[PDB]
Structure 1
């Protein structure tokens, strides 16, 4: 009558296990006091790049816990999956050896149902599409017409993803690299998901794009009182404020350049960089913005304490940057200790204007349109990570006979 699912998320600095218990209607059942069992170990699979057998072994305590959580009679029919990030940055084919060692370990050490596609790297558009499933699952939209689903935007470190449901018309029309449409059937309803991952335009990566605009020169995107170097992907970028410090107007123009808003559009309409926007529409009217779209507001005191998401309009980011872009590093460090925790005080103005620009100029959102940003989303009384794991589990369970 019910089904479990076990999902590993092998991130860059640790590995996490999620176990879910779905009832007959695909609603999550509590496990203890949460809507999942969750645990984490460190370090991540990357720490064992040189020893793949040990990378897989790192996960064994988590697996054992998952084995104890799922009652033994269900084990045979319970899917287990592992999604890895990052891990691609590994030299030679250390990436693939690790994934294979994981497969071997799951096959040797567990009783769970390991499918051929169980262990993989979750790219870019795959992540965006799983996040779309997580969010629309949590909100009870699966099986509804595409127009009642909530599109997702995820500002990762390296990339930003946009995922939202479209018409079969729009899908069929889609331009002929990651394909722009991902077909997924959820609760028996086929969806055509517009999906795109923008490499270089994640939170960390975007700073490098921005600083490239000014080459060896000071940048007005940098706060007064920092004159340093930004390192991204082993490249150094000069990051020094001009004499007058940061400046919202000039930083914004630099950001507009960095985004390649003016890149010619080979299709009907584009976001930026010549990328097709997927045509917009009802599927993109309600949005949930994940990861750094939440972290930044949280770090500049926009979010109520003890909260994992918030409603905001993009104008809120612009208005925040208008103040923050007048401040220096000491001012911002004192105002916003979380930026100091994360070592990104100098980039406060840049980060805000970037998010405002990306949303409005880039993705064509109305600056007054409310969106939800969060790292977690409410499900019953609990919070679910606004990430790919749950969506991955949902998809896995939906392949079972019965769940349909």
Structure 2
């Protein structure tokens, strides 16, 4: 009548386990007082790059907990899965493939759960965006509805940004091309054609390096007064110093437009930036959930009500915020916004706000008055679910079971 599913998320600093229990209608059942069992260990698999067998061993305590959570009669038919992050790739040689294989071996040797051939993998950009689309539209109860009533998702990660939303069977006329542009997925028996794209270099951290490259060795009006230093990304140094008059919303906005490559010639019917096909827009993209750094930034500059994990905002709200912050210096911003000081990113306050505004409006063609939801978590019943890939991955796994088909 019910099913469990176990999903590990192996991140750069830690590993996490998620256990879910789905009832016969594919609604989550509570486990204790939450809608999942969740626990984390540290460090991550990459701390063990030189010793694959130990990277797998790191996970065993999490595994044993998930084995205790799932009642023994359900173990054989419970799918277990691990998805590793961005950075694991950033390991030397085939350190990363050796780690993934040591994990498969450990799961097959030490777990009683159902290990499928595709159980352990790296979740690339478009896969992540597709899974988040499932996480979010599962939570909101949209799976099985016509694409036009689903919610598109945008995820501003560290290195990349993803956009994913559902389109018509016609639109899916999609150019040939690199990550393909359409991901076909059936959920609750309904086929969706999902437009998906991941933009390398345009995540929150990576974007600062694109921006500071435009001004090469010179001062940048995207940097606040009172900072005169260096930004390092992927081992490259980028001079980050304010001009003598400090940050300037206007000039920084122009630099950002340049950095986005808004003027890159469009080989398709329409484009966002960098020559990327926009997927055609339409109903599937009319309501939106923006995750990760689209929430962290508002959170850090006092836009989110205390102890909330999402908010409603219009892109103009980011622009209005930058208009003020871009007149402030580092001491002002540090004192106003301690979270930015925690994350060592005070100097970039003005840049990060213009970037998000420009990315949403000039880049993705959102109306600057259209409300969207930004969040790190989404409401499900009384609880909060991570606005990330794990749940959507579990949902997909379970929908493959002959019981739930």
Q: Distance in 2 between matches of 1:109 and 1:244?
A: 62
**Cα drift, residue 35 of structure 1:** 0.1
Q: Distance in 2 between matches of 1:190 and 1:343?
A: 44
4+ residue runs of structure 1 moved beyond 6 angstroms?
Answer: none
Q: Distance in 1 between matches of 2:225 and 2:185?
A: 49
Q: Distance in 2 between matches of 1:88 and 1:260?
A: 26
Q: Distance in 2 between matches of 1:329 and 1:157?
A: 23
**Cα drift, residue 347 of structure 1:** 0.2
**TM-superposition CA deviations, 1:321-365 (whole Å, max 9, x none):** 000000000000000000000010000000000000000000000
Q: Distance in 2 between matches of 1:385 and 1:140?
A: 16
Map 1:245-284; keep pairs closer than 5 Å: 245-284=246-285
Q: Distance in 1 between matches of 2:57 and 2:330?
A: 44
**TM-superposition CA deviations, 1:15-43 (whole Å, max 9, x none):** 00000000000000000000000000000
Q: How well do the aligned residues superpose, as a CA RMSD in angstroms?
A: 0.3
Q: SS at 1:134's partner residue? A: helix
Q: Distance in 2 between matches of 1:319 and 1:393?
A: 39
Q: Distance in 1 between matches of 2:113 and 2:252?
A: 52
Q: Distance in 1 between matches of 2:155 and 2:303?
A: 18
Q: Distance in 2 between matches of 1:349 and 1:46?
A: 33
**Cα drift, residue 128 of structure 1:** 0.1
Map 1:39-50; keep pairs closer than 5 Å: 39-50=39-50
Q: Distance in 2 between matches of 1:47 and 1:402?
A: 39
Q: Distance in 1 between matches of 2:62 and 2:300?
A: 31
1:321 aligns with 2:322: yes
**Cα drift, residue 402 of structure 1:** 1.8
**Cα drift, residue 54 of structure 1:** 0.2
Q: Could you tell me which residue of structure 2 aligns to residue 124 of structure 1?
A: 125
Map 1:201-240; keep pairs closer than 5 Å: 201-240=202-241
Q: Distance in 1 between matches of 2:233 and 2:284?
A: 34
Q: Could you tell me which residue of structure 2 aligns to residue 10 of structure 1?
A: 10
Q: Distance in 2 between matches of 1:326 and 1:125?
A: 37
Q: Distance in 2 between matches of 1:227 and 1:181?
A: 44
**TM-superposition CA deviations, 1:302-329 (whole Å, max 9, x none):** 0000100000000000000000000000
Q: SS at 2:402's partner residue? A: coil
Q: Distance in 2 between matches of 1:303 and 1:215?
A: 35
Name the TM-score, length of structure 1 as normaliser.
1.00
Name the TM-score, length of structure 2 as normaliser.
0.99
**TM-superposition CA deviations, 1:242-273 (whole Å, max 9, x none):** 00000000000000000000000000000000
Q: SS at 2:220's partner residue? A: coil
**Cα drift, residue 287 of structure 1:** 0.2
- Structure 1 alignment gaps of length 5 or more: none
Q: Distance in 1 between matches of 2:273 and 2:263?
A: 7
Q: SS at 1:33's partner residue? A: coil
Q: SS at 1:254's partner residue? A: helix
